[model samples]
Target: IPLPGRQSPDHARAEAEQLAWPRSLGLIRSDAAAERHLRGGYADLASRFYPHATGADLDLGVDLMSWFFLFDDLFDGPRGENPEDTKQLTDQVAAALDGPLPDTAPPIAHGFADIWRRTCEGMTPAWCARSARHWRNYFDGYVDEAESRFAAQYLAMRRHTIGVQPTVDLAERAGRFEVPHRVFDSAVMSAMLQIAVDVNLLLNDIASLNMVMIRSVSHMQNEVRARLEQYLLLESCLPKVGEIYQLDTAEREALERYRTDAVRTVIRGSYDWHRSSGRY
Candidate 1:
């Protein structure tokens, strides 16, 4: 049989065959016996394999392998969860905006029948005013709820960052204003922002490794959407006579490199506000 730690592929293959099969089918006919033998051999080797090892040199290979496995587990485990959160938030915002307003009343009414008919057609002046008021109330309530949740999350993240890296943490805290208005309107905008900043901060804090940066950027796009939405919402209302400036310039500056590019691309693309109303 090929010995443990042997490098020769042919020898290893031969060893594996010897352990797996018998010289004759009649030699070991039961699967249970083969499995028990294989498990016992592995257990025996694992138990006795380190008896003579000592010092850092002996531990180096196993340590490196363990580190790699740990890193792989960290990177691979949460790949889809962040993006899924973003999608859920996006759907919630869309649903909130898609709700229908109540019918309106007409300006003039010749009789009760005429007034009732105008109300049914959403043409009565009183009904129209009521509809507008109702819509405004609905939107305002949504905004308040979303903003409250976002602010709570933002503050929690800020609190967690205290003294970690005072300046960068402060910057991230200050950068809250940089997220665009549309993002602010989102119910999960704060969570998305926190995820982005947390990923970037984690990347910078961890030991330099390719996979860390790769995964950090991969998950940062959700935050980019939140920021870009805010930018678009504000940009649509720039002063008519002067150059347009971003409302959340500070927040934009704090995003990681990949997220920065994502923000720019989202701004360039058309959004829902662009199509439904000219109000930006």
Candidate 2:
């Protein structure tokens, strides 16, 4: 409901200018393609992700979201139906990531490498490593999505939703601030984070008329409701939040303020997007 660093009109407009759509209009040069991608709702998604990002990194976040959605649009439809093709594309993209810098490469790989370099600029070795892992995991999720579609299989909420890890990982990276490993990696924080992801997934499933997914949380309702009474929440994951948590007096509150702020951005931003978007 109340999200810190949630909206920045000045930054959003600047982010759009940095996009310079006509410049990056490399292959999708057609007016129709341009419109489809430009109006892809990435602006709103960027607000969710880099809600706290500054001039360069904020645009960088939008760039990443653009690639993410484009990757899906370009590959996920009929291309996804072919597992081997997806694998080949995945391997090529991986090479772009790990191999020598591509001075000249295909549009997708070239764009990806560009984004990776910029993201790595301020990133620590740990952030780079974790970001790569999460980045790879996200593509894997896309691959998995394709495979599931081919098989006409839908995933369990638990299984399908693990893909959101990359998201949470990027949210941390987007902050451009140091988050201690304990705060980001702890089991308690993970469980709570997964709750956030699960809620989003539930909303997604509810919104998808095509796939027509249904599940009953009623069974777990009492169990989950009671679990809230249990100690060890995400707030507890932090050493302290505004003088909260038992760790600070002992561990000096390792969790950073902006990280908390970023998480709230994802939560409220997603709510606002789904509330407005017809796709939801």
Which candidate wins on TM-score? 2
Candidate 2 lDDT tens digits, 1-280: 3344365454558446644632473645676766676665666667665566666656766676667666666674677887667766766665655756455555777777777777677767887887777667666666665665671244442333244555555555566555565556666566666565555554555544422433354533443344433323555545444233334432343255433545555555665666666344
lDDT of 2 at 146: 62
Global lDDT of each candidate: 0.29, 0.57
Residue-level error in angstroms, candidate 2, position 280: 5.1
Give a tens-digit lDDT track for model 1, residues 140-245: 3333333434434443433232111211211222122123334433444344334434433333333223323335654544544555455445343333201222
For residue 77, model 2's alpha carbon misses the true position, in angstroms, by: 2.6
Residue 164 displacement in candidate 2 (angstroms): 3.8
The local lDDT score (0 to 100) that residue 30 gets in candidate 1 is 73
Q: How well does each candidate superpose onto the true structure, as a TM-score? A: 0.16, 0.76
**What pairs collide in candidate 2?**
none
